[model samples]
Target chain A: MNGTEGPNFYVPFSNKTGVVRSPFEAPQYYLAEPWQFSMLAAYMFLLIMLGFPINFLTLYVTVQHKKLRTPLNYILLNLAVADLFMVFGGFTTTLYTSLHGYFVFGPTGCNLEGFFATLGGEIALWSLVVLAIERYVVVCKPMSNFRFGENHAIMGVAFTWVMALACAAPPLVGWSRYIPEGMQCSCGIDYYTPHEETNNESFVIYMFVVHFIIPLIVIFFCYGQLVFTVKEAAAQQQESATTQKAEKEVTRMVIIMVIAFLICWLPYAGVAFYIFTHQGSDFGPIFMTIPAFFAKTSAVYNPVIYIMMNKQFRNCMVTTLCCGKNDD
Target chain B: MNGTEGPNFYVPFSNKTGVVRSPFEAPQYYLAEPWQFSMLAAYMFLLIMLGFPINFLTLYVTVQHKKLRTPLNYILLNLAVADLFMVFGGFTTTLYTSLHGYFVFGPTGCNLEGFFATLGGEIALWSLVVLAIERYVVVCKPMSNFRFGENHAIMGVAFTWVMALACAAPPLVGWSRYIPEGMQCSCGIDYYTPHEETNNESFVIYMFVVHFIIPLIVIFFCYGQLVFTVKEAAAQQQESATTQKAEKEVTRMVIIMVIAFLICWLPYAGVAFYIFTHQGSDFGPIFMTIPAFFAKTSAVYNPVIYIMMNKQFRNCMVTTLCCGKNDD
Candidate 1:
């Protein structure tokens, strides 16, 4: 409490009056260019406006409408829930804290965001893996006498959550810790450092080799088979032209989603990988920010793909959000 | 550009430099309470996410869906458009600038926002006036054989816009002016001080008496007649029990909405009036903010009342926004 000797930023919120604070850990008083902070705000705005409601609505609809509660909807619901956690545990904190220029929300708020963010990220990617396989089973094995019922969907959703939770647990156990990293606004598993040494030597294999690459491998195999088989199967039934086109579009779903995932995530993950590859080197703040922005912005990407790929859901959301009365 | 400068409070927006001179003119480098600013972001979050879309969609639905195009929809659409401008011109600037702690926008931006804010506020109050009167004629004078139609709505909307433009015009002419007022971030008619003259002595009487008080008078008078008239009419039609209650509720629509407007706005207006009464005293920053916050928050008040009363619109909004599929 004797801060008479300390520089201003080194302070706590409890002993604090709003009228005063330590300058020691404070953020820059104002953003001069505003390009960086405003961009962050823009994304946060989207997460609040677009990501939160769209995904929440997707789940709500599936649950409310008996007709919409298919096996696919089950998976979609899981994805939506996972995305929400990221928005809550990750994006929300990042948005607010970044605006203030410090990790204002004490330590607990820090780790909570990290755990949830990691949980969300893991579950989202895992669900995609399950989804691609689910699609592959349906498309490539049309007559193979296998059907994914509601029970399979429930199991799939439950398993993805558990797996994501498991992935998020290591930091809690002290294999790592959540720290506000690049831009000083975001906190997560310290991709910015390693426990004992640099290179994030363990995280690289654990994250890239194990967590990410493995899921991607499964996705590629599942979607790869579907892509090759859809064309061949449709060619065999050439007279069914419109049917073939619809089938092809459906076949493109997994690949399209996967492509979207990479677009949303790879920049961040790649940067983390890049961050991992370099140790004890000071990176430009922008180096860290550019990727982090993409990653946070990715929160909405999951729903965008879902809504964009499907016509009925799109119609339902657009017309309904706007309260459009046109039946057609 | 000269080394010698007149006494002035101004900040030049600079490129690549976070240390522009006006960080001096800039606001409290950081919000100690954050309650004031955080609450604002939360509200703006609501405005952008809720108010803007609700208003925009109201217009879209009225225009796109012919069946939804009733006299009430016409009023709703006009109010929504007016509210959208406020969100765009007023709340949006307040949110961002408050964070940055300075007015970065050139004068055009300032006037643009001020114009839009004033435009929207004026139109909204005006629309409500028209809405109440229209409802009054229908409910209180059903047998008078007069009805307001689309032509009437168009004229009403046009008149409101012109009136709002006129109210906002005084600043452009220097009868009054816009300045960075409260929280060191917002620009509006300077309530914090008198313009080289005390009271602007006319604004207090003229603004309170002419602008707001007059419309409210018409509102209360119209609704006052309707309320008494409805009960007597119900008494005359004694055999209709449930129908009598329903009619009574519908009859109260004008009054209810008018009541809502007063509830949303009166506190802020009262505060502004109080600010005027003090004439030329320096005030607490909070004094300025608390009232302005309420006024800014009042943007969503119109819709909140509208949606609360109407089950169909609420259902339509909730389901569409959430993609809720419950048909029944």
Candidate 2:
């Protein structure tokens, strides 16, 4: 049944012995369908309106309005910058490539797209880790007399960028190379390459584990100590207004944002893992699209969550945007 | 050298007899390049973020806030909606079709995109006439028992919608058909169709005179009255702030907006005239993209002008967008 196939790529699993499409290619197509292009258009449209503006507003408001310049807001502002970088670097190219139904950006664009796009997530994720740890220390280890002041926030911001850039650098330096992945729409860590070419076979696995495992471990440790600090403070009735007002909301906001990130990008994370573990398997463009689309959506959602969760922020946005009456 | 081509379309002007390419077709494409598609991606990205939000904020600010519901503001609010409709209707589809390098959407999509796109410009141009007349009345012939009130604004809005719809209706009702025009990136009047098939050789001229000649006459008349009215009143020292506030700015804004509209649309008007009068010539695909691209830019510029000219509106948008302090 698999006859007429020239055996250029891997064979399918047992019951799937009919000629199968490559994750990379199908016979008559090197691209996606019209609907996929339309979907990319819609994704980009949302990001333009929502992702860029909200993050930009956050940064601008913080910078221009002194009241908004807390360490928490500063970290979040940098997060906005990360999302912007992600879209600017990879997803904008994603729109053009997907619309034409082929990867027409050439190999260099593909490489750069993968690097900058991957860098955004790494920057954002690691920054979240650092931000969480700083908050945990501020609240929990008060007797040690530590504080997450503006200078500390600067250190966190500066450190995360360096760390993330360092992490994103390895793929460029030939531990592995970036290649187009998933239906000609995206480029990322070259998953399907043989180990002999650049050690990508093991490289993908180790990269995945490092990004996945370290974050999970860090999240658990930081969050566990945070809960104890907060819970004990609540029991003793010794919580400051800072903890009650800003810290409480900030903690929940970050948690929810992390969850949103996980929910959207988990499918992508799974795809990378799946490609590494299986010898010759891809879920095809159809299966690949869901996760990829989902991953891109997280950028649109972060600003939305910020607007929805904070009453003052919403009021500010409404006045800033709709010119609504500001009785406040 | 041009022998492979037989006569299917036009007979070109002398010394240019290589082969005739229908502005509509070249057997492959007469539309945008890959770079053009990238430019469109950039354009729509701006519109999605800037156009919608700015126009929307204008409308939102006008409607929800009682202070902003002046006659001039009301008229401008409708203008925002008109620009919104233009981009939303024809321009979005315009982006998709051009990106694909050919008209991929079928005739039904064709008909609707054309009708709606035309609908927007028609609505806008006609509404400007009505608004100009209203402002002219308020300033020029104030004692002639003429005033532009809420009812007049309502009537004006209603009239333009109907006017635009009727104008756009002719294309659907067999005056001429909507076909891809201007390098196949646009769906508008079938300018190049044989007179017999469309009954359309006269159709282009009449549509032009109707859209072009009539609007110019109306604008000239209204603005003529507006200038003398504002000048007379300003000299008489009987000009209230309402008159000055509404007249000086309204006259200039309307005048600038009108010129902007003409400058944007003149190339298109010229194209139609060029095709109609020049039996020996139709400009090639390269010539067609300019007018089409220019026409789209006017929408992006409107908000910029509004932001620049109106202080409070500027404040509202800045606070709305850049997250500035709302001292008010």
Candidate 3:
């Protein structure tokens, strides 16, 4: 009997034993055939091409349109720049891989790709976190003096990137390695054989704890307090009835923001934990492939869910896409 | 060697070649060692009891606090209530099973447990999504006078639950079954053989479409648009030299809310996807166990994180927890 024989098989247990086909070589139950890969690539490319120009125009509108030049608008502009980096950096590599199958981009490209992807993803996530905390202080926190100036907002964005870099540092520092596999290559820690003196399990455990567990814990607390704060503010406004509109709008925004974050990244993180713990399992390929797809797809869909669903973003997209000059 | 005399080792090739254990004799893998069962039971019981009181308190603070009664507060109250139900109504049964190593909760309890868990989980997820969308509109599309009011928030919360009920209706309506494995009982459509019938697979696929795929897409879009809006506002504020503190606060809150949502639920969802797709794999136990722990841990951690991290929240929590009075 062939113990280890397949195109996608990583290492044979023994050369004397007959080859057993790798589980990765088996037909994927979820993603299906190569055409599906092609379709995913097409979708990603189109989204990037569409999202970039509109985001750029949003930047221009804030600069040129006098009425639109608010502090909030500046935050939005920074977000756009970060997102642009995310999309452009990620989409090109993803598209190339979907069509060509894993690591045609070579090791350097892989590192750069992993770095950009991690950086963009981390910035996007942390920026949202910062924005939420800022809002909570402004709306729900009793202290009215908690004001973030232009410099502060810039600093906040900068701080977010710094944190992102720290979060993304492990892979770049060789704690994680993204070796090419069948049909795809991803950024992950290199597996150590049992015979290797260095057992990387502890490192893997540490990575998961830092990346998934800590972040999750942080998010829950921030939002829980925000929820209480919003409720308190809403109750106070109920008596006056005069501040209802503003209070309600603030509350609504908080709720929507909470929901968006949960739905967008929860599944991806869940899969990450599973992969982290069961790196040597037979179903590694299956776990990695589908979750990664879902995670990447999440990046593409964030702009639409958070912004374009609003009237402003839709209008911005139309104006930018249409190459129109007028603001309204 | 009587190859065909026993229970048929290769049943397809020969009818009676395997030694079949008696009905009373348990499969080796299915054996429930007492200590393991006891530990599982203890963990689950602790989760349920702790989860219920904490969630109830969360709901109470959001609802009963005079200053804590805003539209946003209402959404949070609803989430807390849902979590309460998840613990009391759903987790109790799980706890019992974990202790006993078999489901004695019966069909009615199973149905109730499944329903409550689904309802609670869905509402919790969707409520956050709604909140995110609201934030996007408020922060990103500030020009639109689309303010969410008490009535609107209520309607949204109600609609979310209704949709959750619809999504969960299939299992109760006999389209699915609650099957108990060696150590756990779960709700899903029945499957007799591996990859034979499409019932469970189709149901899970549908779940992926509705819960994972669509919601993620919506979240990403809303958040992305919000981010873009914030960036533009930030840039404009830099040039204009006039920064609105309120706007900055609002932007900050939205960001924080997004991050919280991601941190809270990402891992659970990701693991759920893995468990669903790779039904026959060894990763099932790990997937189930880790998510179960994380989900409960997330609920407990939220309040703590918020209180410890944010000064305003810390102050509020201390006053509220210590004095049992509304500080604001």
Candidate 4:
């Protein structure tokens, strides 16, 4: 009833009705409370502030230390860049709108923000998949003569950008559209549009499969095989400590990344899937808001897990923060 | 006439009249125009966005490269830290207030912002002097046995903090006071307090002598000796090619920094001095606002000069930006 009462709630881009509306300007919606906006603003401010500097630091550390700039770590550099894009392009406006309690930038801003938010998130998603496969190949399928060389890494990073752009672009042209999500402070692919005539339903389903379901499937499979292979190697006790430890280290990293990936992306993906199946249903705005908040948090995780957890980068970061007083 | 119209224009912090009022809330001031606010906001937004990440990169680069973590470069590290402190502590609030067109944070916020602005600038000022002195001793006074080692660098950094704190802390404790300046958006030490009874004159004089005059004197003297020493050594053909090149390199770095310091700080110092001498005279608010704008630009200079221009840091930065395609 709250969503339906707003006669002005039609999609501006496609000029459609019965679309899921944002809680913004929906006077009766509970999520439009001022305190909630304040909390969201504060949460995003901390993330943007912390994540901006931390990601830059990680990028610099990997670049400065040649040992860390391996073919495998190249994917991580893309990951950091994607995360930066997310925070810089996506989250900043989200923070502004959260404080103001609506999508103040109108349709243009909503489109730009939604495009970048999805762009960054999808780039990060596919980059994670490439990272998992790279790790798996290097660790489990060694001597397959398929070296994950510099050229391959560059190509993979390129693939992520293209893939992400593909996922995030169609909305701008026509097939789908970016609309303010539950809280109206963020824009995303319109998942709540039930009208198959407008092609919105098909776009949402496409995105759900490519962005969420596919990534989850690939990551889970890669890490599971990786974990099993490393365990078998360790149990055989044939390799020396250094090689054994190296295998475990790479395995540990990939597994942690997969776990981090799931934690950050799952809720939002689940919500999107929920919307896809149960279109026009009366799920409270809180359900939508909380999931998107978790998704935005992905920007902060890779820098810490992918870069900071590594001994080389951690040592450099520690050394840098300590002003070079610490030994590598 | 524009600054004098409002009955509400008296100093809010100390309840004093005849204080230099901010263009903010001064209805007729040029800097308070909506376009001006938008321009200032855009300017500051770019600086905050770029400088935040760039400074962090410089800090990490210096830390990661063991060669760059020398005692001399340690001072450079401190310079970067001081610059970061300036942007992070000082400029953010200025940017916020610029957009809002008033000191939204009130008296308490004014004190904190002014203290940090002074603290960061003063620390940077003294650190430059120490850097000049360190290079002079190392290059021009090599056999003096006053090695600019780690402890000495740390001690010098500590001294800068103490001196900066001494300069910036007085206003908060009542020796002088922090108040909204040119535009009410920024807070600084009171230079416009004209009533002889208030101790503001003394505080302003103390800051001018110590913060501006003393550091300038030390920097000029040290760099002057350094240039003469390097030229003399080169003219005499007394040193090997490697040592000669080393001398020129370090000398070149110090000279550029001094030039940068002059460029960023001179306009600011000139206006403060103008206010100090011509107390109670009307200088248009533009004079004050422009100088302060230049001063804030100081936050962006050092990372480029001190780190980005260096071979090691530049290579690392380029490499990182290129995703490690270019070799270091």
- Candidate 1 colliding pairs: A8-A22, A8-A23, A8-A24, A9-A22, A9-A23, A9-A24, A9-A25, A10-A24, A18-B32
lDDT of 2: 0.63
Ranking the candidates on TM-score from highest down gives: 4, 3, 2, 1
Question: Which residue ranges in model 3 land beyond 4 Å of their true spot?
Answer: A1-33, A66-75, A185-207, A237-251, A309-328, B1-328
Q: What tens digits encode model 2's per-residue C-alpha lDDT throughout A1-328?
A: 2211222222222224453443234321423467766776677666656767777876565564455556666777787787787767767777766665545656566666677667777777777787678766766654565667888888889987887776677878777677656554666776554433355544564565456556655664566456545545454657777657877877788788777777877788877656643435534555556676667765566667777786656566666565545513
Per-residue CA lDDT of model 1 for B1-328, tens digit only, reads 2111112222222223343334224454442345656666666667667778777776654555455454566777778887887887677876776555555664445565556666666677777788777766665555467657778877877877777776776766665555444454555554434343322333434455546756665665555445445435435535256764644555455457666666766776766666554434445445555565566645676666666776555565665556554212
Proportion of the native interface contacts kept in model 2: 0.00
DockQ of each: 0.00, 0.00, 0.02, 0.00
- TM match of model 1 to true structure: 0.43
The lDDT per prediction is 0.60, 0.63, 0.52, 0.69
Report the poorest 10 consecutive residues by lDDT, candidate 1 chain B: B1-10
lDDT of 2 by residue, B143-259 (tens): 567556787778888888887777788778777777665445566675554434344544554566566566665665565445344434445647777657745776677777777
CAPRI quality of model 4: incorrect
Q: Return the top candidate by lDDT.
A: 4
| Candidate 3 structure quality by residue, lDDT tens digits, A93-191 | 766665654445655555655566667666666766666666655555556656665667777778778877776666555454433332343443433
- The residue-by-residue lDDT of candidate 1 on A160-215, one tens digit each, is 88777766877666555665545545655655433432222344345554467667
Pick out the ten consecutive residues of candidate 2 chain A with the lowest summed lDDT: A2-11
For each candidate, give the TM-score of chain B. 0.78, 0.82, 0.74, 0.85
Considering chain A alone, report the TM-score of candidate 4 relative to the true chain A: 0.86
